[PDB]
Amino acid sequence: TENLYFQSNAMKYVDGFVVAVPADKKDAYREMAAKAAPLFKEFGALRIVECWASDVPDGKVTDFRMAVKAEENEEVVFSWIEYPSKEVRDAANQKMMSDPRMKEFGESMPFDGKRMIYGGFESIIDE
Amino acid sequence: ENLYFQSNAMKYVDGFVVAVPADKKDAYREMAAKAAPLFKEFGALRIVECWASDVPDGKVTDFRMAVKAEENEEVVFSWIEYPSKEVRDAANQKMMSDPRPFDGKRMIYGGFESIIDE
Numbered sequence: 001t002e003n004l005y006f007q008s009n010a011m012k013y014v015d016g017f018v019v020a021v022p023a024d025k026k027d028a029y030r031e032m033a034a035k036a037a038p039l040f041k042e043f044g045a046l047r048i049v050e051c052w053a054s055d056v057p058d059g060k061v062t063d064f065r066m067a068v069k070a071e072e073n074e075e076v077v078f079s080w081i082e083y084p085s086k087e088v089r090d091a092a093n094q095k096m097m098s099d100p101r102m103k104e105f106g107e108s109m110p111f112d113g114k115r116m117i118y119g120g121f122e123s124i125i126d127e
Numbered sequence: 128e129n130l131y132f133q134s135n136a137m138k139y140v141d142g143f144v145v146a147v148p149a150d151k152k153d154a155y156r157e158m159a160a161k162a163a164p165l166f167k168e169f170g171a172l173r174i175v176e177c178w179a180s181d182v183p184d185g186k187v188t189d190f191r192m193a194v195k196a197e198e199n200e201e202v203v204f205s206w207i208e209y210p211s212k213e214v215r216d217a218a219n220q221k222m223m224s225d226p227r228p229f230d231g232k233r234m235i236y237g238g239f240e241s242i243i244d245e
C-alpha cells in the first residue's frame with residue numbers, strides 16, 4: 001500500500017537487467033522469476049519487477065532488440081531489483097550465488113545468459 | 128482466483144536506457160526532476176532515473192554497447208510506471224500534443240507489461 005516514508009527512503013540502488021527470452025518460454029520464465037523473487041527479498045531486495053515486451057520500437061542506430069541481439073523467436077524482457085544501498089545489493093548477490101536454491105531451479109535458464117545485459121545503478125531521481 | 132486483481136494489479140512500464148556525457152550528470156538530473164511532475168500529472172505512478180555504478184563490460188552484449196556509449200559517456204537506466212498501457216499511451220500523447228544533455232537516437236526505449244512485481 002502507498003507509504004510516502006518508504007516511497008521516499010527505501011530504494012537507493014538498482015540492478016537492471018535486459019534479457020532476450022524465447023516467446024514460447026514466457027510461462028517458464030515467469031515461473032523461474034517467481035521462484036527467484038522471494039529469495040532476493042530474503043537477502044535484502046526491496047522489490048523485483050520483470051516486464052515483457054509490449055510496444056518496443058525498432059531503430060536503425062540502437063534499440064532494445066539490438067541491445068540483447070534478440071533472435072526472431074525471442075522477446076525482450078526489461079527487469080530490475082531495488083535495494084536500499086549498494087552494500088545490500090552486493091551482499092544479496094553474493095548470497096544468491098552461494099544458495100543451492102538457485103543452483104537448482106536457476107541453472108535451467110529459459111534464456112541465453114550470454115546475451116543478457118546487467119549492471120548496478122545508483123538512484124538519482126525517484127519521484 | 129480474483130479477476131479484479133488479475134485485471135488491475137500489474138503495472139505498465141516505459142523503460143529507457145540512455146548514453147549521457149559523464150560531465151552532464153547534474154544537467155541530466157535537473158532535466159528529469161523537471162519532467163517528473165509533468166509525467167505524474169499525466170498519470171505516471173513513478174519516475175526513476177539511475178546512473179551507472181557497477182556496469183560490467185561484455186564481449187557479446189552489455190549496457191554500454193546497448194546505447195553505443197562513447198568513452199566520455201555513462202549509461203542511465205530509467206523507467207516510468209503506469210497503471211496500464213492506456214494510461215501510458217494517454218500520458219505520452221499528452222507529452223506529444225500539449226505542454227512545454229544526451230544523444231536521443233542512441234537512447235533505447237520501449238513499453239513493457241509487468242509480469243512479476245514482488
Ligand code: NA
Nearest residue numbers: 058059060063
Ligand atoms: Na533495429
Ligand code: NA
Nearest residue numbers: 090091093094
Ligand atoms: Na561479490
